[PDB]
């Protein structure tokens, strides 16, 4: 039978890949970074508290100005907060209250949302009437939308629960490119700083790298023990960190095709929900189901501090484009800014 | 540009006013999550409530809306964690088909022991009891073939059979209920409880049952809040 031969050949290719990965594993980055000085204790405090949400929060994204932000809750509202003065600029009602993601366009002209409705809704912040209104509704996914990010005002990359990613042109409303190959639900994606590539992590404990222009899965990483919930590029763009449900974070390199760092502790037994790097990439902020946040030294794997300000699980987390502050949103319907 | 800051101030004030206006309605409405396998009667239940994601009904000036997720894929692992604040989960079980009952019990156990759903009570609707009645009366499909413990099960004394009901039917239906309550009580731990109910496709009083069960859930949540219960 041809199926058995194909399975045997795939197993042989997997063995070859493992052998090639072990060949390049001459040493570990722990030995190389054992000679650098520790960053010291990092104790951040809640400088701003953003209250007003009615239910659990799932997403946030700081814009290029590092001033405005977006947040989604299960009351069906999208609130645009001004991080500096804690003011609310907009409060966008949603037709479907079960949203899970948000995106802030680099130009600040659009916001995005999506969830169990299987629709990616784009709202125009800059309106001539002074009132925010929806612009486009992107349909075609057969699963819940997990995360979406803007490339520009004309291209949006979306991740859905039907194990597929899709690059859409907002104006035409059509799926310009379709990314397939994942077996389980894909939960998060991040775009590269040059927007040339983007990685996405799924429930099959695997991350896949995709070229936006051609839709071909360039490379694939495995190693997680459970479902992947978070992913974000290193600020350099040649590495990325992933959080999983097995209480471990893993930092991989694009060119090395291997796992570089594993961040875990024996006293944490809950999954990771959000992961993001700082401006220099030295601090990796991760959110945990144990109602806390932890900052890892992305170079020495040692915890540099804890952000215990939430009484419920933290679901979204983010750093500025300027590296100035970090926002955490949890299921208690509050956002907190740390600096 | 203090004028701009003042303008943002009244914009914020208006936004908070509208947000409180919506908050009153949100607190005044009750979420419900409808779940169950296919060919169970969930469509019939929502039709009686008058295939759709959402349903809205009002009983005694109390507004309930039920969410039934059909567009999502077969996996229920991660799109269910967004239902941790619903008032209750209406679990519909087809009692007439013994082949797929074990899947229903496994799903109920998975919902009951869920880390994010340990506070969510489950209202159990054992639908299509008439078909189970003809099934047990025919004697072609024996429960002992699928559930050996039924051979040694005795009907509980706190049973309220309908007039003229065959006690074999009563024993079978209460055996199914006993299995479900056995699954429920193992880790009930006082946070959440299961409310069994015996219903048929021709019932028109279903909406009242969920109303009473939600009243009981809120009463018991308040009692546990004050440490009485």
């Amino acid at each position, epitope marked *: 039978s041809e199926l058995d031969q194909l399975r045997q050949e795939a197993e042989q290719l997997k063995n070859q890949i493992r052998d090639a990965r072990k060949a390049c594993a001459d040493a570990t980055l722990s030995q190389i970074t054992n000679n650098i000085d520790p960053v010291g204790r990092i104790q951040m405090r809640t400088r701003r508290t953003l209250r007003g949400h009615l239910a659990k929060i799932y997403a946030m994204h700081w814009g290029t100005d590092s001033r405005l932000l977006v947040s989604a809750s299960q009351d069906g509202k999208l609130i645009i907060w001004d991080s500096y003065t804690t003011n609310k600029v907009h409060a966008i009602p949603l037709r479907s209250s079960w949203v899970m993601t948000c995106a802030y366009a680099p130009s600040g002209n659009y916001v995005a949302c999506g969830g169990l409705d299987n629709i990616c809704s784009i709202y125009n912040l800059k309106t001539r009437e002074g009132n925010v209104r929806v612009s486009r509704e992107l349909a075609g996914h057969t699963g819940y939308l997990s995360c979406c990010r803007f490339l520009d005002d004309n291209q949006i990359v979306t991740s859905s629960g039907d194990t597929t990613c899709a690059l859409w042109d907002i104006e035409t409303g059509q799926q310009t490119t379709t990314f397939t190959g994942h077996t389980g639900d894909v939960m998060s994606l991040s775009l590269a700083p040059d927007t040339r590539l983007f990685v996405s992590g799924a429930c099959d404990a695997s991350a896949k790298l995709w070229d936006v222009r051609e839709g071909m899965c360039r490379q694939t990483f495995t190693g997680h*023990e459970s479902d992947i919930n978070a992913i974000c590029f290193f600020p350099n763009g040649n590495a990325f960190a992933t959080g999983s449900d097995d209480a471990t974070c893993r930092l991989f390199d694009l060119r090395a095709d291997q796992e570089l760092m594993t961040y875990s502790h024996d006293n944490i037994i809950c999954g990771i929900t959000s992961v993001s790097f700082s401006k220099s990439g030295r601090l990796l902020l991760a959110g945990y189901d144990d109602f806390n946040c932890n900052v890892w030294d992305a170079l020495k794997a040692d915890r540099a501090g804890v952000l215990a300000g939430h009484d419920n699980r933290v679901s979204c987390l983010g750093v500025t484009d300027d590296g100035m502050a970090v926002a955490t949103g949890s299921w208690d319907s509050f956002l907190k800014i740390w600096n | 540009q203090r004028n701009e800051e003042k303008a943002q101030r009244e914009a914020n004030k208006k936004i908070e006013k509208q947000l409180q206006k919506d908050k009153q309605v949100y607190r005044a409405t009750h979420r419900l999550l409808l779940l169950g396998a296919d060919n169970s009667g969930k469509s019939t239940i929502v039709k009686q409530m008058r295939g759709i994601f959402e349903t809205k009904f009002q009983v005694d000036k109390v507004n309930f809306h039920m969410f039934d997720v059909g567009g999502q894929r077969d996996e229920r692992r991660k799109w269910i964690q967004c239902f941790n604040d619903v008032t209750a989960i209406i679990f519909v079980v087809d009692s007439s088909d013994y082949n797929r009952l074990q899947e229903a019990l496994n799903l109920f156990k998975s919902i009951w022991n869920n880390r994010w759903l340990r506070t969510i009570s489950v209202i159990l609707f054992l639908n299509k009891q008439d078909l189970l009645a003809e099934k047990v009366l025919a004697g072609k499909s024996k429960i002992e073939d699928y559930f050996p413990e039924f051979a040694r099960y005795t009907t509980p004394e706190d049973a309220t059979p309908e007039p003229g009901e065959d006690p074999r039917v009563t024993r079978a239906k209460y055996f199914i209920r006993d299995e479900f309550l056995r699954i429920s009580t193992a880790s009930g731990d006082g946070r959440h409880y299961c409310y069994p109910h015996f219903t048929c496709a021709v019932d028109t009083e279903n909406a009242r049952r969920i109303f009473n069960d939600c009243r009981d859930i809120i009463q018991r949540m308040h009692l546990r809040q004050y440490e009485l219960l």
Partner: nanobody
Amino acid sequence: QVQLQESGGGLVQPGGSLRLSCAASGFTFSNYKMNWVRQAPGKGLEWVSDISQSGASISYTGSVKGRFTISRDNAKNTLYLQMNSLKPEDTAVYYCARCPAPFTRDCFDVTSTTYAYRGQGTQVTVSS
């Protein structure tokens, strides 16, 4: 990379005894609840067995109650299922399915279409 490989089974006369061994590699076997799932020809996947993290709690399907025995060895990282007195309706393809999350008594692995944490499947056939 998660790899759950099951072995054993095949053609056998009714009433025989068979042993199925599931090999788990690439993860902590002790921290995961494990299940045995079979797929009857022409029917969807159905739950057949269960085992907890420490083996304290053991459950079976009512149909296979009293005939199937499940054994778990955390040190060797191998899951065993021993079947005796097979029935002609017990023929199916058996998968070694792992429960989705660690340190949890919850499983959603009875899914039919796609599930990452399952093996290819070992066919067992009973006939005269």
